[PDB]
Amino acid sequence: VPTPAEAALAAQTALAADDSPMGDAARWAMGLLTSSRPEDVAARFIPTFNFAETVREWRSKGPFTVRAYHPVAHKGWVVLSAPAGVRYILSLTLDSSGLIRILTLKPETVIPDMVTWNDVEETLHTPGVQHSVYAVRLTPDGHEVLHASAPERPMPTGSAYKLYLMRALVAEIEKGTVGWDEILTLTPELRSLPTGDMQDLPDGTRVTVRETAHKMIALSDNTGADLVADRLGREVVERSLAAAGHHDPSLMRPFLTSHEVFELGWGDPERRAEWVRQDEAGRRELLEKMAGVMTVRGSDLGATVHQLGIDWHMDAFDVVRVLEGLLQDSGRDTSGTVEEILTAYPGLLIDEERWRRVYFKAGASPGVMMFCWLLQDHAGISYVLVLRQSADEQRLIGDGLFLRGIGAKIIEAEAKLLSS
Ligand SMILES: O=C(O)[C@H]1/C(=C/CO)O[C@@H]2CC(=O)N21
Numbered sequence: 001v002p003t004p005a006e007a008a009l010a011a012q013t014a015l016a017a018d019d020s021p022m023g024d025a026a027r028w029a030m031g032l033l034t035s036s037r038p039e040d041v042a043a044r045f046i047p048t049f050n051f052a053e054t055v056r057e058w059r060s061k062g063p064f065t066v067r068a069y070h071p072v073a074h075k076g077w078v079v080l081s082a083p084a085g086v087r088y089i090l091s092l093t094l095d096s097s098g099l100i101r102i103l104t105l106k107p108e109t110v111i112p113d114m115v116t117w118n119d120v121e122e123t124l125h126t127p128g129v130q131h132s133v134y135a136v137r138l139t140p141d142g143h144e145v146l147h148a149s150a151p152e153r154p155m156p157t158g159s160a161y162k163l164y165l166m167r168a169l170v171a172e173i174e175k176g177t178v179g180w181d182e183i184l185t186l187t188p189e190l191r192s193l194p195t196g197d198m199q200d201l202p203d204g205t206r207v208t209v210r211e212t213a214h215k216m217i218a219l220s221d222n223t224g225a226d227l228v229a230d231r232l233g234r235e236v237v238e239r240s241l242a243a244a245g246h247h248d249p250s251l252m253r254p255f256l257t258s259h260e261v262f263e264l265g266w267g268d269p270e271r272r273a274e275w276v277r278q279d280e281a282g283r284r285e286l287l288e289k290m291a292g293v294m295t296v297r298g299s300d301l302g303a304t305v306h307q308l309g310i311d312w313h314m315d316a317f318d319v320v321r322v323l324e325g326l327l328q329d330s331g332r333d334t335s336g337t338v339e340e341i342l343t344a345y346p347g348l349l350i351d352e353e354r355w356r357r358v359y360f361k362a363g364a365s366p367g368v369m370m371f372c373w374l375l376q377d378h379a380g381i382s383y384v385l386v387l388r389q390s391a392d393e394q395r396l397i398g399d400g401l402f403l404r405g406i407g408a409k410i411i412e413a414e415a416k417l418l419s420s
Protein backbone atom coordinates (compact mmCIF):
# COMPACT_ATOMS: atom_id res chain seq x y z
CA VAL A 1 0.00 0.00 0.00
CA PRO A 2 1.83 3.13 -1.32
CA THR A 3 3.43 5.48 1.25
CA PRO A 4 3.24 9.25 0.43
CA ALA A 5 6.69 9.36 -1.26
CA GLU A 6 5.98 6.14 -3.19
CA ALA A 7 2.63 7.37 -4.52
CA ALA A 8 4.00 10.81 -5.58
CA LEU A 9 6.89 9.12 -7.36
CA ALA A 10 4.50 6.69 -9.10
CA ALA A 11 2.31 9.64 -10.20
CA GLN A 12 5.27 11.60 -11.56
CA THR A 13 6.55 8.58 -13.55
CA ALA A 14 3.04 7.73 -14.86
CA LEU A 15 2.49 11.32 -16.06
CA ALA A 16 5.85 11.28 -17.89
CA ALA A 17 5.10 7.87 -19.47
CA ASP A 18 1.44 8.45 -20.42
CA ASP A 19 1.41 8.06 -24.21
CA SER A 20 -2.16 9.27 -24.87
CA PRO A 21 -4.11 12.46 -25.51
CA MET A 22 -4.51 13.04 -21.75
CA GLY A 23 -0.78 12.35 -21.18
CA ASP A 24 0.18 14.89 -23.86
CA ALA A 25 -2.22 17.59 -22.58
CA ALA A 26 -1.36 17.04 -18.88
CA ARG A 27 2.40 17.27 -19.64
CA TRP A 28 1.93 20.45 -21.64
CA ALA A 29 -0.25 22.09 -18.96
CA MET A 30 2.27 21.14 -16.24
CA GLY A 31 4.94 22.69 -18.49
CA LEU A 32 3.04 26.01 -18.38
CA LEU A 33 3.29 25.86 -14.59
CA THR A 34 6.85 24.74 -14.03
CA SER A 35 8.71 26.57 -16.85
CA SER A 36 10.03 30.13 -17.31
CA ARG A 37 3.55 32.20 -26.38
CA PRO A 38 0.13 32.79 -28.07
CA GLU A 39 0.74 30.46 -31.07
CA ASP A 40 1.61 27.43 -28.96
CA VAL A 41 -1.48 27.99 -26.77
CA ALA A 42 -3.82 28.39 -29.75
CA ALA A 43 -2.68 25.03 -31.08
CA ARG A 44 -3.27 23.14 -27.79
CA PHE A 45 -6.84 24.31 -27.15
CA ILE A 46 -10.10 23.97 -29.03
CA PRO A 47 -10.47 26.51 -31.91
CA THR A 48 -13.23 28.44 -30.06
CA PHE A 49 -11.18 28.95 -26.88
CA ASN A 50 -6.79 36.71 -20.81
CA PHE A 51 -5.07 33.31 -20.64
CA ALA A 52 -1.61 34.88 -20.27
CA GLU A 53 -2.76 36.60 -17.04
CA THR A 54 -4.45 33.35 -15.93
CA VAL A 55 -1.15 31.45 -16.34
CA ARG A 56 0.86 34.20 -14.62
CA GLU A 57 -1.52 33.97 -11.65
CA TRP A 58 -1.31 30.14 -11.55
CA ARG A 59 2.50 30.26 -11.76
CA SER A 60 2.63 32.69 -8.78
CA LYS A 61 1.17 29.97 -6.55
CA GLY A 62 4.05 27.52 -7.15
CA PRO A 63 6.52 25.92 -7.27
CA PHE A 64 4.48 22.74 -7.73
CA THR A 65 5.18 19.06 -7.09
CA VAL A 66 3.02 16.36 -8.69
CA ARG A 67 1.46 14.19 -5.91
CA ALA A 68 -1.24 12.26 -7.84
CA TYR A 69 -2.27 11.79 -11.48
CA HIS A 70 -5.74 10.59 -12.47
CA PRO A 71 -6.29 10.24 -16.19
CA VAL A 72 -9.78 9.01 -17.17
CA ALA A 73 -10.36 9.09 -20.94
CA HIS A 74 -11.02 12.75 -21.92
CA LYS A 75 -11.01 13.99 -18.29
CA GLY A 76 -7.95 14.19 -16.09
CA TRP A 77 -6.85 15.48 -12.72
CA VAL A 78 -3.37 16.20 -11.37
CA VAL A 79 -2.95 16.80 -7.65
CA LEU A 80 -0.17 19.29 -6.87
CA SER A 81 1.49 20.52 -3.71
CA ALA A 82 2.70 24.11 -3.62
CA PRO A 83 4.78 25.60 -0.76
CA ALA A 84 3.76 25.16 2.91
CA GLY A 85 1.59 22.05 2.33
CA VAL A 86 -1.02 23.89 0.24
CA ARG A 87 -2.57 21.64 -2.45
CA TYR A 88 -4.24 22.34 -5.78
CA ILE A 89 -5.81 20.26 -8.50
CA LEU A 90 -5.30 20.85 -12.21
CA SER A 91 -8.39 19.59 -14.11
CA LEU A 92 -8.38 18.90 -17.83
CA THR A 93 -11.23 18.14 -20.18
CA LEU A 94 -10.32 17.31 -23.78
CA ASP A 95 -12.15 17.20 -27.10
CA SER A 96 -12.22 14.24 -29.47
CA SER A 97 -8.75 14.82 -30.97
CA GLY A 98 -7.07 15.75 -27.69
CA LEU A 99 -7.40 19.56 -27.76
CA ILE A 100 -8.03 21.16 -24.40
CA ARG A 101 -11.57 22.38 -23.79
CA ILE A 102 -11.34 23.18 -20.07
CA LEU A 103 -8.24 23.77 -17.97
CA THR A 104 -8.50 24.95 -14.32
CA LEU A 105 -6.18 25.15 -11.31
CA LYS A 106 -8.23 25.23 -8.12
CA PRO A 107 -7.89 24.61 -4.37
CA GLU A 108 -7.73 20.86 -3.62
CA THR A 109 -10.97 18.89 -3.35
CA VAL A 110 -10.50 16.80 -0.14
CA ILE A 111 -12.29 13.44 0.09
CA PRO A 112 -11.30 11.15 2.97
CA ASP A 113 -11.13 7.34 2.68
CA MET A 114 -14.61 5.97 3.57
CA VAL A 115 -15.08 3.25 6.20
CA THR A 116 -18.84 3.58 6.82
CA TRP A 117 -21.92 4.99 5.09
CA ASN A 118 -22.01 7.59 7.84
CA ASP A 119 -18.54 8.79 6.71
CA VAL A 120 -20.13 9.35 3.31
CA GLU A 121 -23.06 11.33 4.75
CA GLU A 122 -21.03 13.44 7.15
CA THR A 123 -18.47 14.25 4.42
CA LEU A 124 -21.04 15.18 1.78
CA HIS A 125 -23.47 17.26 3.83
CA THR A 126 -23.24 20.98 3.01
CA PRO A 127 -25.59 23.56 4.52
CA GLY A 128 -27.81 24.95 1.73
CA VAL A 129 -27.37 21.81 -0.41
CA GLN A 130 -29.92 19.00 -0.70
CA HIS A 131 -28.14 15.70 -1.32
CA SER A 132 -29.06 12.07 -1.74
CA VAL A 133 -27.06 8.85 -1.68
CA TYR A 134 -28.68 5.59 -2.81
CA ALA A 135 -26.83 2.25 -3.12
CA VAL A 136 -28.45 -1.11 -3.92
CA ARG A 137 -27.61 -4.66 -4.89
CA LEU A 138 -29.84 -5.86 -7.78
CA THR A 139 -31.38 -9.31 -7.33
CA PRO A 140 -33.82 -11.57 -9.28
CA ASP A 141 -36.55 -10.66 -6.79
CA GLY A 142 -35.89 -6.94 -6.10
CA HIS A 143 -33.24 -4.55 -4.80
CA GLU A 144 -31.34 -4.93 -1.52
CA VAL A 145 -30.82 -1.42 -0.06
CA LEU A 146 -27.25 -0.94 1.12
CA HIS A 147 -27.73 2.74 2.05
CA ALA A 148 -30.37 5.42 1.41
CA SER A 149 -30.60 9.11 2.04
CA ALA A 150 -33.62 10.80 0.50
CA PRO A 151 -33.92 8.45 -2.51
CA GLU A 152 -37.63 9.31 -2.69
CA ARG A 153 -36.88 13.02 -3.28
CA PRO A 154 -37.24 14.05 -6.95
CA MET A 155 -34.22 16.18 -7.86
CA PRO A 156 -32.76 17.73 -11.04
CA THR A 157 -30.26 15.38 -12.69
CA GLY A 158 -29.02 17.27 -15.76
CA SER A 159 -27.59 14.83 -18.42
CA ALA A 160 -28.78 11.76 -16.53
CA TYR A 161 -31.79 12.29 -18.82
CA LYS A 162 -29.63 10.98 -21.69
CA LEU A 163 -30.09 7.52 -20.09
CA TYR A 164 -33.82 7.80 -20.91
CA LEU A 165 -32.98 9.05 -24.38
CA MET A 166 -30.77 5.95 -24.80
CA ARG A 167 -33.62 3.62 -23.74
CA ALA A 168 -36.02 5.38 -26.11
CA LEU A 169 -33.48 4.95 -28.95
CA VAL A 170 -32.99 1.24 -28.16
CA ALA A 171 -36.80 0.71 -28.11
CA GLU A 172 -37.02 2.17 -31.64
CA ILE A 173 -34.02 0.16 -32.94
CA GLU A 174 -35.75 -2.98 -31.62
CA LYS A 175 -38.92 -1.89 -33.53
CA GLY A 176 -36.87 -1.30 -36.66
CA THR A 177 -38.01 2.30 -37.01
CA VAL A 178 -34.41 3.54 -36.82
CA GLY A 179 -31.11 1.83 -37.62
CA TRP A 180 -27.64 2.11 -36.06
CA ASP A 181 -26.10 3.03 -39.44
CA GLU A 182 -28.80 5.54 -40.40
CA ILE A 183 -27.40 9.02 -41.05
CA LEU A 184 -28.21 12.07 -38.94
CA THR A 185 -27.33 15.53 -40.20
CA LEU A 186 -26.05 18.48 -38.11
CA THR A 187 -27.88 21.69 -38.95
CA PRO A 188 -27.51 25.14 -37.34
CA GLU A 189 -30.78 24.58 -35.45
CA LEU A 190 -29.58 21.25 -33.98
CA ARG A 191 -26.34 22.63 -32.49
CA SER A 192 -26.22 22.82 -28.67
CA LEU A 193 -23.58 23.91 -26.12
CA PRO A 194 -20.94 21.66 -24.48
CA THR A 195 -20.57 19.26 -22.69
CA GLY A 196 -19.68 17.39 -25.90
CA ASP A 197 -17.75 17.83 -29.15
CA MET A 198 -20.32 17.42 -31.96
CA GLN A 199 -21.20 21.13 -31.87
CA ASP A 200 -17.71 21.78 -33.27
CA LEU A 201 -18.55 19.90 -36.51
CA PRO A 202 -19.54 21.92 -39.63
CA ASP A 203 -23.13 22.46 -40.71
CA GLY A 204 -24.25 19.52 -42.87
CA THR A 205 -21.97 16.96 -41.17
CA ARG A 206 -23.36 13.43 -41.60
CA VAL A 207 -23.01 11.02 -38.66
CA THR A 208 -24.48 7.60 -37.88
CA VAL A 209 -27.03 7.07 -35.15
CA ARG A 210 -24.45 4.70 -33.58
CA GLU A 211 -21.66 7.29 -33.37
CA THR A 212 -24.12 10.01 -32.29
CA ALA A 213 -25.46 7.84 -29.45
CA HIS A 214 -21.89 6.91 -28.49
CA LYS A 215 -20.93 10.57 -28.02
CA MET A 216 -24.30 11.35 -26.36
CA ILE A 217 -23.40 8.90 -23.54
CA ALA A 218 -19.59 8.69 -23.50
CA LEU A 219 -18.98 12.45 -23.88
CA SER A 220 -22.33 13.55 -22.48
CA ASP A 221 -22.68 15.23 -25.81
CA ASN A 222 -25.60 17.72 -25.76
CA THR A 223 -25.58 18.15 -29.53
CA GLY A 224 -25.50 14.35 -30.01
CA ALA A 225 -28.43 14.02 -27.56
CA ASP A 226 -30.39 16.69 -29.44
CA LEU A 227 -29.71 14.92 -32.75
CA VAL A 228 -31.17 11.70 -31.29
CA ALA A 229 -34.13 13.53 -29.67
CA ASP A 230 -34.89 15.24 -33.02
CA ARG A 231 -34.74 11.94 -34.91
CA LEU A 232 -36.96 10.10 -32.43
CA GLY A 233 -39.43 12.93 -31.87
CA ARG A 234 -40.44 14.27 -28.46
CA GLU A 235 -43.57 12.10 -28.35
CA VAL A 236 -41.53 8.90 -28.74
CA VAL A 237 -38.98 10.02 -26.11
CA GLU A 238 -41.86 10.80 -23.71
CA ARG A 239 -44.19 7.87 -24.55
CA SER A 240 -41.26 5.79 -23.52
CA LEU A 241 -40.50 7.18 -19.97
CA ALA A 242 -43.13 5.07 -18.21
CA ALA A 243 -41.68 1.85 -19.69
CA ALA A 244 -38.09 2.80 -19.21
CA GLY A 245 -38.61 3.23 -15.42
CA HIS A 246 -39.92 6.79 -14.42
CA HIS A 247 -42.29 7.28 -11.41
CA ASP A 248 -44.00 10.59 -12.34
CA PRO A 249 -43.44 11.20 -16.07
CA SER A 250 -45.36 14.51 -15.85
CA LEU A 251 -42.18 15.99 -14.25
CA MET A 252 -40.43 15.56 -17.62
CA ARG A 253 -43.20 16.61 -19.95
CA PRO A 254 -42.49 18.27 -22.19
CA PHE A 255 -39.22 16.32 -22.26
CA LEU A 256 -36.75 19.12 -22.86
CA THR A 257 -33.73 19.05 -25.20
CA SER A 258 -30.40 20.43 -23.95
CA HIS A 259 -30.78 23.34 -26.48
CA GLU A 260 -34.19 24.12 -24.95
CA VAL A 261 -32.87 24.04 -21.35
CA PHE A 262 -29.99 26.41 -22.28
CA GLU A 263 -32.10 28.74 -24.37
CA LEU A 264 -35.07 28.88 -21.98
CA GLY A 265 -32.97 28.85 -18.77
CA TRP A 266 -30.54 31.65 -19.70
CA GLY A 267 -32.19 33.59 -22.53
CA ASP A 268 -35.12 36.04 -22.61
CA PRO A 269 -36.37 36.48 -18.98
CA GLU A 270 -39.94 37.16 -20.18
CA ARG A 271 -40.02 33.88 -22.14
CA ARG A 272 -38.78 32.13 -18.99
CA ALA A 273 -41.56 33.75 -16.91
CA GLU A 274 -44.09 32.53 -19.50
CA TRP A 275 -42.84 28.94 -18.97
CA VAL A 276 -43.34 29.22 -15.24
CA ARG A 277 -46.97 30.36 -15.47
CA GLN A 278 -47.97 28.00 -18.36
CA ASP A 279 -49.54 24.56 -18.28
CA GLU A 280 -48.27 21.60 -20.35
CA ALA A 281 -50.06 22.86 -23.49
CA GLY A 282 -48.68 26.41 -23.09
CA ARG A 283 -45.18 25.04 -22.50
CA ARG A 284 -45.25 22.90 -25.65
CA GLU A 285 -46.51 25.94 -27.62
CA LEU A 286 -43.72 28.07 -26.15
CA LEU A 287 -41.06 25.49 -27.11
CA GLU A 288 -42.35 25.22 -30.70
CA LYS A 289 -42.17 29.04 -31.00
CA MET A 290 -38.62 29.07 -29.50
CA ALA A 291 -37.31 26.61 -32.15
CA GLY A 292 -34.36 27.96 -34.16
CA VAL A 293 -30.63 28.63 -33.78
CA MET A 294 -29.46 29.16 -30.17
CA THR A 295 -28.80 32.70 -28.90
CA VAL A 296 -27.55 31.68 -25.47
CA ARG A 297 -23.78 31.24 -25.10
CA GLY A 298 -21.75 29.41 -22.44
CA SER A 299 -20.95 32.81 -20.89
CA ASP A 300 -24.67 33.40 -20.13
CA LEU A 301 -25.06 30.43 -17.78
CA GLY A 302 -24.86 30.83 -14.02
CA ALA A 303 -28.15 31.48 -12.27
CA THR A 304 -30.03 28.34 -11.19
CA VAL A 305 -33.26 27.47 -13.05
CA HIS A 306 -33.86 23.82 -12.05
CA GLN A 307 -36.33 25.06 -9.40
CA LEU A 308 -38.50 26.31 -12.30
CA GLY A 309 -38.62 22.83 -13.91
CA ILE A 310 -35.99 23.70 -16.53
CA ASP A 311 -33.96 20.51 -16.08
CA TRP A 312 -34.88 16.82 -15.84
CA HIS A 313 -36.30 15.69 -12.50
CA MET A 314 -36.31 12.12 -11.20
CA ASP A 315 -35.97 10.25 -7.91
CA ALA A 316 -33.09 7.85 -7.04
CA PHE A 317 -35.39 4.88 -7.72
CA ASP A 318 -35.90 6.16 -11.29
CA VAL A 319 -32.16 6.21 -11.87
CA VAL A 320 -31.78 2.61 -10.66
CA ARG A 321 -34.65 1.52 -12.91
CA VAL A 322 -33.25 3.18 -16.02
CA LEU A 323 -29.79 1.66 -15.44
CA GLU A 324 -31.23 -1.80 -14.72
CA GLY A 325 -33.32 -1.45 -17.91
CA LEU A 326 -30.26 -0.50 -19.93
CA LEU A 327 -28.45 -3.61 -18.55
CA GLN A 328 -31.43 -5.64 -19.83
CA ASP A 329 -31.46 -3.80 -23.19
CA SER A 330 -27.73 -4.38 -23.59
CA GLY A 331 -28.06 -8.11 -22.93
CA ARG A 332 -30.80 -8.43 -25.55
CA ASP A 333 -28.64 -6.68 -28.14
CA THR A 334 -26.49 -9.59 -29.42
CA SER A 335 -24.51 -7.18 -31.67
CA GLY A 336 -22.87 -5.50 -28.63
CA THR A 337 -23.67 -2.01 -29.96
CA VAL A 338 -25.50 -0.88 -26.79
CA GLU A 339 -22.87 -2.43 -24.52
CA GLU A 340 -20.01 -0.66 -26.32
CA ILE A 341 -21.75 2.74 -25.95
CA LEU A 342 -22.57 2.20 -22.26
CA THR A 343 -19.11 0.98 -21.16
CA ALA A 344 -16.90 3.36 -23.15
CA TYR A 345 -16.49 5.91 -20.33
CA PRO A 346 -16.77 4.61 -16.76
CA GLY A 347 -16.02 8.01 -15.13
CA LEU A 348 -13.22 6.57 -12.95
CA LEU A 349 -10.27 4.23 -13.20
CA ILE A 350 -12.00 0.85 -12.65
CA ASP A 351 -10.64 -2.36 -11.09
CA GLU A 352 -11.41 -4.59 -14.11
CA GLU A 353 -10.44 -7.73 -12.23
CA ARG A 354 -13.34 -7.01 -9.86
CA TRP A 355 -15.91 -5.50 -12.22
CA ARG A 356 -16.87 -7.12 -15.54
CA ARG A 357 -18.89 -4.08 -16.60
CA VAL A 358 -19.49 -0.55 -15.40
CA TYR A 359 -22.03 1.88 -16.70
CA PHE A 360 -21.67 5.50 -15.74
CA LYS A 361 -23.47 8.80 -16.23
CA ALA A 362 -22.99 12.29 -14.83
CA GLY A 363 -25.27 15.30 -14.90
CA ALA A 364 -24.53 18.92 -14.16
CA SER A 365 -26.38 22.23 -14.53
CA PRO A 366 -26.09 25.38 -12.44
CA GLY A 367 -27.09 24.29 -8.91
CA VAL A 368 -27.13 20.57 -9.98
CA MET A 369 -24.65 17.71 -9.76
CA MET A 370 -25.20 13.95 -10.03
CA PHE A 371 -23.17 10.82 -10.65
CA CYS A 372 -24.49 7.30 -11.06
CA TRP A 373 -22.84 3.92 -11.70
CA LEU A 374 -23.96 0.37 -12.38
CA LEU A 375 -21.15 -2.05 -11.50
CA GLN A 376 -21.47 -5.77 -12.27
CA ASP A 377 -18.91 -8.29 -11.03
CA HIS A 378 -17.65 -11.38 -12.91
CA ALA A 379 -20.20 -13.63 -11.10
CA GLY A 380 -22.91 -11.31 -12.39
CA ILE A 381 -23.85 -9.49 -9.19
CA SER A 382 -24.85 -5.85 -10.00
CA TYR A 383 -24.72 -2.80 -7.70
CA VAL A 384 -26.12 0.67 -8.51
CA LEU A 385 -24.90 3.87 -6.81
CA VAL A 386 -26.76 7.17 -7.26
CA LEU A 387 -25.31 10.44 -5.89
CA ARG A 388 -27.22 13.72 -6.21
CA GLN A 389 -26.85 17.36 -5.11
CA SER A 390 -29.03 20.42 -5.77
CA ALA A 391 -28.68 23.98 -4.50
CA ASP A 392 -29.93 27.50 -5.12
CA GLU A 393 -26.35 28.68 -5.59
CA GLN A 394 -23.81 27.00 -7.88
CA ARG A 395 -20.85 27.91 -5.59
CA LEU A 396 -22.26 25.56 -2.95
CA ILE A 397 -21.84 22.68 -5.37
CA GLY A 398 -18.67 23.47 -7.33
CA ASP A 399 -17.15 21.66 -10.32
CA GLY A 400 -18.37 18.15 -9.34
CA LEU A 401 -15.02 16.65 -8.41
CA PHE A 402 -16.28 16.45 -4.78
CA LEU A 403 -19.35 14.27 -5.56
CA ARG A 404 -17.41 12.22 -8.18
CA GLY A 405 -14.61 11.65 -5.66
CA ILE A 406 -17.08 10.52 -3.02
CA GLY A 407 -18.25 7.91 -5.59
CA ALA A 408 -14.61 6.94 -6.26
CA LYS A 409 -14.06 6.38 -2.55
CA ILE A 410 -17.24 4.28 -2.19
CA ILE A 411 -16.19 2.13 -5.14
CA GLU A 412 -12.61 1.82 -3.77
CA ALA A 413 -14.21 0.62 -0.50
CA GLU A 414 -16.71 -1.66 -2.23
CA ALA A 415 -15.83 -4.66 -0.01
CA LYS A 416 -16.88 -2.60 3.05
CA LEU A 417 -19.75 -0.55 1.62
CA LEU A 418 -21.32 -2.52 -1.26
CA SER A 419 -20.50 -6.20 -1.12
CA SER A 420 -19.96 -6.70 2.61
O1 LIG B 1 -19.25 13.45 -18.02
C1 LIG B 1 -18.71 13.96 -16.98
O2 LIG B 1 -17.99 13.25 -16.22
C2 LIG B 1 -18.91 15.44 -16.62
C3 LIG B 1 -20.36 15.87 -16.61
C4 LIG B 1 -21.19 15.75 -17.66
C5 LIG B 1 -22.63 16.20 -17.55
O3 LIG B 1 -22.85 17.37 -18.34
O4 LIG B 1 -20.76 16.44 -15.34
C6 LIG B 1 -19.71 16.16 -14.41
C7 LIG B 1 -18.97 17.43 -13.93
C8 LIG B 1 -17.91 16.91 -14.87
O5 LIG B 1 -16.82 17.39 -15.21
N1 LIG B 1 -18.53 15.69 -15.21
Ligand SMILES: O=C(O)[C@H]1/C(=C/CO)O[C@@H]2CC(=O)N21
Nearest residue numbers: 070077079348404405408409
Ligand atom coordinates in the same frame (compact mmCIF):
# COMPACT_ATOMS: atom_id res chain seq x y z
O1 LIG C 1 -9.45 8.41 -6.96
C1 LIG C 1 -9.96 9.35 -6.31
O2 LIG C 1 -9.89 9.41 -5.06
C2 LIG C 1 -10.68 10.45 -7.04
C3 LIG C 1 -9.84 11.68 -7.21
C4 LIG C 1 -9.46 12.48 -6.20
C5 LIG C 1 -8.60 13.71 -6.47
O3 LIG C 1 -7.60 13.83 -5.45
O4 LIG C 1 -9.48 11.90 -8.59
C6 LIG C 1 -10.05 10.83 -9.34
C7 LIG C 1 -11.24 11.35 -10.16
C8 LIG C 1 -12.01 10.70 -9.05
O5 LIG C 1 -13.19 10.78 -8.75
N1 LIG C 1 -10.93 10.05 -8.42
